[PDB]
Design a protein around this nucleic acid. Structure first.
Ligand SMILES: O=C(NCc1c(F)cc(F)cc1F)c1cn2c(c(O)c1=O)C(=O)N1[C@H]3CC[C@H](C3)O[C@@H]1C2
Ligand SMILES: O=C(NCc1c(F)cc(F)cc1F)c1cn2c(c(O)c1=O)C(=O)N1[C@H]3CC[C@H](C3)O[C@@H]1C2
Ligand SMILES: [Cl-]
Ligand SMILES: [Cl-]
Ligand SMILES: [Mg+2]
Ligand SMILES: [Mg+2]
Ligand SMILES: [Mg+2]
Ligand SMILES: [Mg+2]
Ligand SMILES: [Zn+2]
Ligand SMILES: [Zn+2]
Ligand SMILES: [Zn+2]
Ligand SMILES: [Zn+2]
Lengths: 32, 270, 270, 69, 31, 252, 47
DNA sequence: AACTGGTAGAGATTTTTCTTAGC
DNA sequence: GCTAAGAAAAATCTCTACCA
DNA sequence: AACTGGTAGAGATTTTTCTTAGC
DNA sequence: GCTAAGAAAAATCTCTACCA
């Protein structure tokens, strides 16, 4: 949802939560 | 996805002729695809590539042009490497008078290359006969491109400003033209060496002759053949003449071509 | 010495009009004296100072001009801060049609300042009456200087290239002019914000109104008068309104003038 | 038989992608933009183009050269 | 360093380079 | 350095060499060598032209010759009045540096128009090579006569053959190479003289070895990065920069 | 131009289900459009 | 004493993003 | 599992013609 | 397949030169 | 006696109009 300098907001399981960048891996998604 | 966006962008450009930023933002396609949609259109493509070239400035090249002043015809020739000017007033703009002007110029100075535009007096059989007899190579510019002859049009501007400066000291226009040629050639300084145009043409032609005679005497007593290794494949090329050896690289001549090869890739043989 | 050289240089310039480098090298006088000898001559001094100015780009300024295409008269107005274009075809180049065009423009958009050249239709009593009724300040450019109105002549060029792009989709010239106005205003992007011209005029006018209302609400509840010390003499000036206090300097308003004063030279009083 | 066909298609692919350019140029007394042409030689400052079996020299300030991706 | 028929070898700031003949002006420069 | 200056002074004392040869041989700068020549009591034209008129086939040919090289400029005049002679002189003075003109006592050479052109262009005119050059030019004109139709074309073709095709003399040069060499040598001498006067407007106070008193005012000749050549007591000597003080001199 | 190559690559993937580097090398289209042609197919997956 | 050049596209150079080989 | 080389793709910079 | 913008002056900014006050 | 501040004078850099 949002990618910050040190924080990342993700949607999972109909829930929004904030994970820091040191525990995240962002990959491209091809799900058209 | 954006494949239907690509089809919509092609229809939209066919109607409105959008640029690539408008299509890449409205239809959300990448910028390479939008650049291709604009680049495959013939109604667009009306713009050049925004650069300038550089003219030939060899020590025996002259440029020539004709200009008009008070209902007269002036013809101007300029030596390109120094800025040295000859100019005269013609009774008409025919090819006979242009051929006589070029023959007097070749009788006074060494002329080997002449550059002109495509005027009717320069593309003439009389001018062609004079260039054949005096051994001059004549080149013409691209038609309707006055930037090919940039030096002689700049000198048209300078000659007209000097003529308006000293106009009230002469009666006729021909006297004023010769007075302006004298003022340009000997009374104005500044440029490459702080010279005038007359001092610069003397320096350029004298240095040309002296440097040819010096390296004739140098090359007639040489030795030290050089075998060198260059190319995309590490091959060996033939007999090369060593010209100068410097701290870091050497200068060789191979097939009348000058090359600068580093010292690791060559060996000198007495 | 060089005092007789100064007299000889004055006689020589009176005859030949040397430049300062020629006289300073031939007569061995210093360069300040040779520069003065050239600067006291009226036959010289034919050259400008080689700079460009910048035009007024306030958020309610419009520029206007007339151009010709296929024997018709087009009239173009441009909003300067955004690049937004209105254009029409006139039956004649009189002052009545120019006054009607300006009245329709003022009925559509907020116009407070109009800049034109000195054409006969713009210096007219009908245009003066419309500007009086609609409260517009009309300014004219320096005569025979098209660089004063640079934006509307640039837009003359852009409008003519779009009209040659979409010419074979219309029958008359007036339809083609309105299609080119639509293509410029809404189908071309790139510039300050990556906008088109329509998005940029909406953003500029809306941000103008919003920022005035915000600082009205901010300034109506202020406090903290400021006494500050500035000037060539260390004096004390009167009551100033504190606007913003930053780490290093403060912003004060004195006599409807905004000033940035460092923190050492001011004291805040509640 | 098949291997020589593969090598020939590879070399023809490289030769077809070396110099297939289009040129839109601007020439004449009234300098209008004219249609596509084939690039023959490109020096610094000017190009030689072939248009309708006519050879022309155009400066690079009055031409646009379109490549292939 | 050397003046050829279509190329000139110059030394500029301890860098040797080869320039075409039509892009050079060779002076002795008294001054 | 000082060894080279003493060797150059001894060699000039024997053989009286010139300054270009001494500067090339003994490896000293050119202003020092020019000073060595200038201090000798036993050691103390590129811009003179001659004009004449001649006749050929009922036409008037006017010939100007550069004397130090044998260089020729010629023309065909419509008449032999003073206005056409003044126009030919103005064109010659516009293309070459002309300072001294030598003519005979003809009518058209003694005229108000020629006098006004010589006043405006600052030429010294004297009334009294050209005849030998006229004979040589007319042999060439009768040699290449059948390659041209008119007489003006044959005159200019003979001027080209004389200037750039006939070689002789000491080194085997044509006339155009000799005139360019002569004028270039004169240009080198005037530029060096300008530098000499600009340097010699200074003055030097120097402190000799094992003395704490400054010596007399010696005139500056050459100023280097670490050395200074001064003239004092009709003697040239080299003092380093750490024992020198250079001040402006106003001694006009 | 490669837009006709885009249309031909869509037909070719509807038949044979090529990978994206194969379509990019054979039809001379960029890699983003080739990955998009793979991505819009429900049976395939770009890897 | 109170006025004024600008716009948009073509290449060239530099920076950011994306996939895959290797330890 | 993590890094980094290498290439693709996007962003920034310099320079040109035309507007009576 | 083998062609091409340039010149000179007006200010602005930076560097070199010259005189004199001070320790 | 030596240094350095300060100003004068010279040198270098950027940018403009005009040449059919
Ligand atoms: O536009 C001219 N100059 C101005 C200018 C410039 F000098 C340099 C620039 F970079 C830009 C410029 F705008 C110009 C035009 N022509 C001729 C010129 O000599 C000439 O200088 C010329 O002789 N011809 C003949 C050959 C065929 C016919 C007769 O048309 C052409 C037209
Ligand atoms: O030379 C013009 N443009 C070209 C150009 C440019 F746009 C911008 C530039 F930086 C340089 C340019 F060379 C041009 C000339 N004139 C008028 C124009 O509008 C106009 O655009 C105009 O209206 N008048 C009226 C007012 C008095 C009479 C009628 O003469 C003037 C002439
Ligand atoms: Cl032409
Ligand atoms: Cl006007
Ligand atoms: Mg011409
Ligand atoms: Mg011309
Ligand atoms: Mg107008
Ligand atoms: Mg206008
Ligand atoms: Zn299009
Ligand atoms: Zn003057
Ligand atoms: Zn002697
Ligand atoms: Zn599939």
């Amino acid at each position: 949802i949002w990618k910050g300098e040190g924080a990342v907001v993700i949607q999972d399981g109909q829930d929004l939560k904030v994970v820091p960048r040191r525990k995240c891996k962002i990959i491209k998604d091809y799900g058209r | 996805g954006f494949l239907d966006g690509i089809e919509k962008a092609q229809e939209e450009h066919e109607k409105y002729h959008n640029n690539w930023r408008a299509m890449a933002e409205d239809f959300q396609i990448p910028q390479v695809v939008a650049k291709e949609i604009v680049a495959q259109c013939p109604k667009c493509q009306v713009k050049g590539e925004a650069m300038h070239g550089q003219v030939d400035a060899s020590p025996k090249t002259w440029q020539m042009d004709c200009t008009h002043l008070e209902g007269k015809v002036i013809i101007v020739a300029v030596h390109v490497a120094s800025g040295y000017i000859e100019a005269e007033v013609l009774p008409a703009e025919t090819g006979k008078e242009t051929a006589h002007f070029l023959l007097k110029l070749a009788a006074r100075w060494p002329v080997k290359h002449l550059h002109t535009d495509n005027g009717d007096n320069f593309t003439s059989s009389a001018v062609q006969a004079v260039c054949w007899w005096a051994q001059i190579e004549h080149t013409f510019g691209v038609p309707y491109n006055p930037q090919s002859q940039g030096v002689v049009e700049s000198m048209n501007h300078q000659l007209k400003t000097i003529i308006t400066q000293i106009r009230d000291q002469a009666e006729k226009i021909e006297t004023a033209v010769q007075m302006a040629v004298l003022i340009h050639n000997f009374k104005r300084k500044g440029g490459i060496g702080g010279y005038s145009a007359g001092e610069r043409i003397i320096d350029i032609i004298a240095s040309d002759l002296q440097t040819t005679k010096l390296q004739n005497q140098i090359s007639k007593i040489q030795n030290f053949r050089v075998y060198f290794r260059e190319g995309r494949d590490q091959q060996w090329k033939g007999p090369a003449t060593l010209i100068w050896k410097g701290e870091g690289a050497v200068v060789i001549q191979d097939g009348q071509d000058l090359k600068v090869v580093p010292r690791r890739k060559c060996k000198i043989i007495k």
